[PDB]
Amino acid sequence: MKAIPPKIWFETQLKGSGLDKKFQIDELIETQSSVRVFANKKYLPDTETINEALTKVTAVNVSGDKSGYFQNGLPFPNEAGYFEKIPVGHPELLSPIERLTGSKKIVSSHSLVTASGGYPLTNPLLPYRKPIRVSIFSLAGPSFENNYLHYRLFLLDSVQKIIDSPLFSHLHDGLPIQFDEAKKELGEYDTNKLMARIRLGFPYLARFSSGGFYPSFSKSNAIIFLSEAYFRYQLEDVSLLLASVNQTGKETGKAALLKATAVGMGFFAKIDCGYDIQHIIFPYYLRAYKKLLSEHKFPWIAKIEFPIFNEIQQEQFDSIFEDYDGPTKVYRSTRDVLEFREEEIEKYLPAAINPSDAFALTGNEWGYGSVESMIGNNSSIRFDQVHHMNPLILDPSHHVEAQINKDHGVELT
Amino acid sequence: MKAIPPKIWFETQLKGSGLDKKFQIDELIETQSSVRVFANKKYLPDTETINEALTKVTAVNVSGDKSGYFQNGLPFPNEAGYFEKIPVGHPELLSPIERLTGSKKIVSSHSLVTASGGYPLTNPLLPYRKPIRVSIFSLAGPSFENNYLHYRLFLLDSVQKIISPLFSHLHDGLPIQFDEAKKELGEYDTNKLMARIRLGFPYLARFSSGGFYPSFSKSNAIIFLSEAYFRYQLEDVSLLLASVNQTGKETGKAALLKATAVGMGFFAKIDCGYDIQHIIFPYYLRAYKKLLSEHKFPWIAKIEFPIFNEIQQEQFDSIFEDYDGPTKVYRSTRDVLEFREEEIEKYLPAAINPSDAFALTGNEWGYGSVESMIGNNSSIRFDQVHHMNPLILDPSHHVEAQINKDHGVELT
Amino acid sequence: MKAIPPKIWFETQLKGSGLDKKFQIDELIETQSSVRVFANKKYLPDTETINEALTKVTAVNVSGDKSGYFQNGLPFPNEAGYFEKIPVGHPELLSPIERLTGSKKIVSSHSLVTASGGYPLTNPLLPYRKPIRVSIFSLAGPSFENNYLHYRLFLLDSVQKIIDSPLFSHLHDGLPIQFDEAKKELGEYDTNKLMARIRLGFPYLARFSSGGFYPSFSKSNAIIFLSEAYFRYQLEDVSLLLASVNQTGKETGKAALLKATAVGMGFFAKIDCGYDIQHIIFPYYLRAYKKLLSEHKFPWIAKIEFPIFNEIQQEQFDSIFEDYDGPTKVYRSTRDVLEFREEEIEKYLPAAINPSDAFALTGNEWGYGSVESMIGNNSSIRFDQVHHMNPLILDPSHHVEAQINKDHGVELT
Amino acid sequence: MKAIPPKIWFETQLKGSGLDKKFQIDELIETQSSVRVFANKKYLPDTETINEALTKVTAVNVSGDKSGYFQNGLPFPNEAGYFEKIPVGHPELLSPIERLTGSKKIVSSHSLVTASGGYPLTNPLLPYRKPIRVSIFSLAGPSFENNYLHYRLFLLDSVQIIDSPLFSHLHDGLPIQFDEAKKELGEDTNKLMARIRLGFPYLARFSSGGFYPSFSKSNAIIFLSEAYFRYQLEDVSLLLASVNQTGKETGKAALLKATAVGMGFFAKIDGYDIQHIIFPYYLRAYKKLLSEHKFPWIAKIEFPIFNEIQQEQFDSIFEDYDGPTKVYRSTRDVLEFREEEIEKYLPAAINPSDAFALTGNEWGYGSVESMIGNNSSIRFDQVHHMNPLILDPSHHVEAQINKDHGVELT
C-alpha cells in the first residue's frame, strides 16, 4: 500500500529470507569488491548508461512483466501495456529498447556459495559442508515471454510484418525482415539457411492478425523465426561471456571451469509464456560456443560444462559438438549449476552463468522458482551484484568496457 | 543396458520432461496431500494388496505389453508371453489375474492443470493463462488389446472355448463354453445375455491358430458375454460415482464430471485392427443410466460425456432420452481437461483419466493417448505415482469401498 | 401410346420373344389341360373372386408398381400412388387388399421346360436336349417393395403405428400390433419371441415421421417386424403349397422332387426396393416347412430341395434343420430351379416353385430379370398359366378349393 | 479344404453376394465393354506383363498379406514370409517388386452404382432410387502396411540403403543410406528427406524389427520425401490423363472424386499412421500437374477429406492455386452424386485399390475399395473371371510419361 525506500525494502527481504545471516562482515567485503560489469561498448557507451541499466529496474519481475514488485515494494499495476509504453528517459525504469540494449552486459562476482540445487522440483537442496566461492556471470538472455522485448528482433508474423529496430540493424544485414516476402522465399519449405517456420513438434505456431497465438496445421499464419539474426545475437552474448570468464581466470591465475547454463532456454523460451520455443533456439546457442571456441584459444578457460537435462537438447549437443576440435574441453552433464567437487575447486576457477533478467534486481524472485532465484538463495549474489548492498557496481573502476570486433574477438577496456 | 533405481529413473524422466515448469512447491504440497485410493474391498482387501496394485507395474506400457519400459529403465524383453507367464507373487510385476482385480481401484487427486488438448493429433494443445485445478480420477477400464487380460472374461471362441474364479459372480446363469453358446443362439446372433460381434454384416472370427479375421460364417465367430460385461461396468461406474460424489462432499461443492469414454479407444481394439467400441459403449452408458436412476449423488451436479464418434453420439442420445434423474447428463465434443472459469467457480471440476492397471499413472511420455496427454498437462505424475508421492501408499489415504447388491457403495 | 386388345398384345410379345416357336401345337394342349388353381377358400371363396385374382392384374410389374405395363400395353401412369388408390371393384385392377387376399392361391401346370438357368448373371442358360416336363407352382410371396402390400401386415413404425387389416386379424391374435407399446415390451432388447427390430447388419432400419426410411444407430424410430404374425402367414402359404404338390404327385402316380425356391427372398425382401430384410424373414420361411413337414404326412413328396446361394442363408438352413426328424427328406443345393437330371425325371415328379407376382400376368417381365421371368422364358408357363392363352385357368373344374384347419392340415375340394 | 477352379470360385462369391440384384444383362454388356487398362509403359511394356499384373493376384488380401484367400478359395499359408519370398516368375503370384511395378496402371470402367456409403461404420449405406453410372478408376497407392512393398522405396531405418533398381529415377540425386542420412539432418527435415514426427516423438525401428515411439534420433526412420513426390507425380498424371481421356470419349467433362488413395490402411506402419506425412505430397502432385497442363475434359476435382489435419493442409496448399480445373474439398462419400451433377458431368471416382487382390478385394464393407465393390458393378467389370475383355489388348492404353509429365496415350 505505502511505498518503502528501496534500500530499506531490499534489506527487509534479506532479513525475511534469512540471507543476512549466511555471510560474515569480512566475507561480504571480499566478494563485494570482486564485482565487475562487462559492458558491450556499442550498446552501453558510458558510465551513465551502464548504471542506468543496473538501477532503473524493478525488484521482482516474472511472466514477461505480468507480475512482480517495484524497488519500493509496490506491486505492478493491473493495466497491461504499462511497461511497453515506458519512454526512453523515464526517471525510474528502462524502456523496452533500453531493456534490449541494456541486456548487452555481464555482471560477475566471486561469490560465496553455501548450497547447490533446490530449483527444479526434482533437484534437492544440497548444502556445502563449508561455503565455496564461484565466479557467477549474470547474463540476461533473449526473452520471448511478451511481444515487445526480443520478439521484435527475431519473429515475423501477421501483426509484426516487419522488423523495426535500427539499433540492432546489423543483426539483419542481408536477411529478410518482412513477413510476406519471407513466406515467398521459403516456398513450400519450412526452413532455409536464414529462417524457419516455428513447429511445436508437428503443428505450426501461428498468430492471428487479431494478435493471439494458436497452433495450426496450416503454413499460412505460421510465424517465422529469423534464425541467422538470432545466431548473430548469440555470438555477441557468448563472445562477451567467454571473454569476461577468460579474463577473470587470467586475473586469478587459474583456468576456468565454466558451467554454461542454458540461458534463455527456460522461462524466456516461452512465447506468450506458453509456447515452448527452446528446441528451436537452443541449437544456435550451442553453435555460438562451437564457432567461438573453434576460432579462439581462451587459454584461461579449460573446460566448459553444459548442464542439459532434456533428451532432445542432449542429442542436439552431441550432434553439434561431434566435430569439435578446439583446445577448450566441452562436454554436457546433468549436474546442478552450483555443484562442484572439491578437486575441481582446487584446480580451476569455478564459474557459472546466472541466467538473469535485465529488468529485475539480480536474484529476481525470492523463492526457488527459477535458476537465478535459486542462485540468489544459495550464494552472496544479492549482496555482491545489487547496488543497494554493493555501491561498487556503480563505480566506473569496476566496469570493463568491451569492444566486439567483426571476427568476434573481444578487446577489454 | 544397465538398471537405474526406479525413483531415480522416474525423476530423470520428470526432469527432462519440462512439464513441471509452472508448478510451485507450495502447490505440489497441496495437490499431493489430496491423493486418494478408492479400492473395491472385494478385490483389493488390504493395504498390502492395494500397495502391490499401485507399485508392481511397469513404468511405460505400449500396445498392450508389446513394448515399453520397466521402472528401472530397462526395455521389455523381446520374447512373447513374458507378461502372460507372470505368476501371482512375482517379486516385481503383477500377474494377469492381478491386473484384472487390480483395476478395481480408483486413484484421484486435485491436480494442477496447465494446458488442455494435445492427444489426438488433431486436438490442439492450448496453455491455460493460469494453471487451474481439476480432481482427476484414474480408472483403468477393461482392456481387449491382448487376449490374456479382460479378453478372458467377456469373449468365447474356438481357441479359448470356455476359459476365472474371482469373477465367477459376473456369470450368474450366463453360459461358459463356446460350443454351448453357439447352440443357444441358433440361427440368430443375439439373446439377452450374449451376442456375436458384428463388424457390420461380417462377424469377428478367430482361427484356432490365433489371429482374427472377418467372417460371414458363424463357426469361428466369437461370442461376447454382454451381461457379464455390463455387471463389470456397473462395478466400475458405481465406484467412480461414489468416489466423485464423496470428493465433492468433502470440498463442499457439487462436481462437473467429465465422463471420459474409458476403454473405448486403445483398449477397445482386438488384434491390432478390430475395433469393438460400437458394441461395448452402450453397456458403459447404461451402467451410468441405471446408477444415476437408482441413486442420488447430491454432490455430482452434472456429468458431461465427451463423445466424438457419430455412432456413440447416436447411442448416447437413444440411451438417455428416458433419463429423468437429478444429476444432469449431456454430451459434448470438448477436451477432457478444458473447463470455463465460470464452471470452475461453481463446481468441483472432475474428469476421468482412462488409465492402465499395469503402468505408472500417466503411462507414455508423449501425447499418444488420453492418459499421457493428461500426464503432460497436469501434475498427475507428481500426485499419483508413489516415487513422487509416498502418501498414495499410506493407508490413511486409502478408502475401502464395499459395493452391495443394489450397487450402493459404502465408503470406509 | 394407343391401347391394344389384351389378348393381341400378349400374342405380340409371344412372337416378339421367340416363345411361339418353342412348343408344338399338340404339346401345348396337353400342358394347358394340366392347369390348376389351388385357392385358399378363407380368402378366395368362389369362382368369381378366383377369376378376378387371375385376370385383374397388370401385364408386367416391377419395383413395387413403379415400372411396368398394363395388359393393354400402355405404360404405368406417372401419378405416384395410383395403384395404392385402386378401390375394391375397379373395372380392371385388384385393390391393395385384394392383392393380399389374392396371393393366397397357387397356380400350377405340368409345363414343358426347354432349358434351365439364365437368370442370375452367374447362372448360364443350359438348354435341354429335349424338352422335359416340370410341375410348376406359381406362388406370390409377401412383398415389401412398397408400403401398401405386406408391409401393412408385419411392420410397426412411426407413421404406421398400428396394423389395421381386419381380414388378416387371425395372424395377429394375441400378438402386439401397436408400435409404441411394442417398443416398451421390447425394452432394452431388440428381439421378442414375437417381434424384432430390423437391423441391416449393424445399424437399425428406421423410418422418419415424414415417411422416409434411413439406417440409424439409434433404436428410437427403428421399425419392428411382427415375426410371429409373419410365421403364421408362411404356415398358410407353405401348407397350401405342400398340399397342392402332394395332390399333384398323387394324381401322377409318382412322388415329387420339389424345388423349394426361396419365394419372397429376392426382389420382394427389399423394403422400399432398397433395404434388404431377406436375412430376417428367411428363417421363418424355413421353420414353416420344418414345422409342417414334421407334423403332417406327405406320401407323394419324395424330397424337398432348397436352392440356397447365400452363405448366411445356408448356415440358417443347416442350423434350423439340424433338429429335423420328419419323414420327408430335406436338403439344400446350389442347383438352378429348373435343372433336373434324367434319372430324377424318371423316378420322380419334377416340381418347382415359381416365386410369382400377385398383380402381374404369369411370367411377368420378358427378359431374364428374375426367377419368374427366367421360368417364363425357359418353359411353357406363359401358354399354360395366362388366361389369354389358356381359358381353362378360368374354368371352375380347374379350380381346387383348399381349406386349412387349425392344425394346418389341408382338405382339397 | 480343397481347391476350386478360380472362375468357379469367383462366380460362387458373386452369386451369394446379392450385389448384382439391380443389374440388367443389357447394362452389364455396356459396363463390361467400357473396361480400359491404362498402363505406364515404363513399368508394363507389353500385353503379357499387363495381363500378369491383372491375374497373378490373390482373391482377397487382408491386413497386408496377413490373411486372405487365393483365387482357388484356399486360405493363406500359416507361414510368415511366404509372400515376401514369392520369386519373379512364380506361376501364379507377383513377386514383391512386380507388385511395385504392377501398381503403375489404372483399371477404369463406366460402372453401375446402386448405392453410396457404407464403409466407415459411421457412414450410412444409402441406396440410389435408380442405379447411376460412374467411371471408377482403380489405382493402388503405395503400401506401407508391411516392410517389403513401398517401405523399401521411401524409408530408411536401422534394419537396412534403398535397393530397388527400376525405381532409381525416383532417387536420381537423392541419398541412399540411413547412417549417412542421419548426419545430413544433424540437429529433422531438409529439402529431400524428413524424420517421421508422431508429434514430439519420432517413429523409431530397432534392429529387432519392431516400431516404437522415441524422442531419440538414433532408430528414428527417415522418409525420402522427394522420391515419394516423384512417384505420386507418375500416379496422378496417369490418373488425370486417363480421366481426361475418358471424358473425351464420352463427350462430357468429368467431375472427378479424388479419393485419398494410400492415406488409410496403406498409411499404417506395423498402428503407426503416417498419413499426416505423405498426404501433402499427394495434394502437391495435383497442384503441380493441374497448373502445368490442360485437362479440357476434367471440369472439377472434388477431394473427399474427413480429417482436420488433411483439411488444413489442403486449404494451405491450394490457397495459391489458380489453374483452370476447379479444385475443392468435401466431406461427401466417393460415390455420392446429385441428379444435376450426373446429368451435367461424367461422374468419376478413384477406387483406392490393391495391386495384389482382385478388384473389389474383401467382400464386407471394411474399406473404400470393398465398399465400392459392393455398391457398384466393378467386380463384373474389372475382374478377368467375369470380363475377359480386360485381358484384350484393344482394351489396353499405353501411357508414356515424358519428363515434363505430359502423357501420350497409346
Ligand SMILES: Nc1ncnc2c1ncn2[C@@H]1O[C@H](COP(=O)(O)OP(=O)(O)OC[C@H]2O[C@H](O)[C@H](O)[C@@H]2O)[C@@H](O)[C@H]1O
Ligand atoms: N539446477 C539447474 N542447474 C543447471 N541448469 C538448470 C537447472 N535448473 C534448470 N536448469 C536449466 O537452465 C535453463 C534456464 O533456466 P531459467 O531459470 O528458466 O532461465 P531463463 O533464461 O530461460 O529465464 C530468465 C528469467 O527467469 C528468471 O526469473 C530470471 O530472473 C529471468 O526473469 C533451464 O531451462 C534448464 O534448462
Ligand SMILES: Nc1ncnc2c1ncn2[C@@H]1O[C@H](COP(=O)(O)OP(=O)(O)OC[C@H]2O[C@H](O)[C@H](O)[C@@H]2O)[C@@H](O)[C@H]1O
Ligand atoms: N482429448 C480427449 N478428450 C476426451 N476424450 C477423448 C479425447 N481424445 C480421445 N478421446 C475419447 O476417450 C476415449 C478413450 O481414450 P483412450 O486413450 O484410447 O483410453 P483407453 O481406455 O481406450 O486405453 C487406455 C490405455 O491407453 C493409454 O495408453 C492408457 O495408458 C492405457 O494404456 C477415446 O477413444 C475417445 O473416445
Ligand SMILES: Nc1ncnc2c1ncn2[C@@H]1O[C@H](COP(=O)(O)OP(=O)(O)OC[C@H]2O[C@H](O)[C@H](O)[C@@H]2O)[C@@H](O)[C@H]1O
Ligand atoms: N436360378 C435360381 N434358381 C433357384 N433360386 C434362385 C435362382 N436365382 C435366384 N434364386 C433364388 O430365388 C430367390 C427369389 O427370387 P426372386 O426372383 O428375387 O423372387 P421374389 O419372390 O423375391 O420377388 C418376386 C417378384 O420378382 C419377379 O418380378 C416376380 O414376378 C415378382 O415381381 C432369389 O432371391 C434367390 O435366392
Ligand SMILES: Nc1ncnc2c1ncn2[C@@H]1O[C@H](COP(=O)(O)OP(=O)(O)OC[C@H]2O[C@H](O)[C@H](O)[C@@H]2O)[C@@H](O)[C@H]1O
Ligand atoms: N466413403 C469415403 N469416401 C471417400 N473417402 C473415404 C471414405 N472413407 C474413407 N475415406 C478416405 O480415403 C482413405 C480410405 O482409403 P482406404 O480404404 O483406407 O484405402 P488405402 O489406399 O489406404 O488402402 C487400400 C487397401 O484397403 C483395401 O482393402 C484395398 O483393397 C487395399 O487393400 C481414407 O484414408 C479416407 O481419407
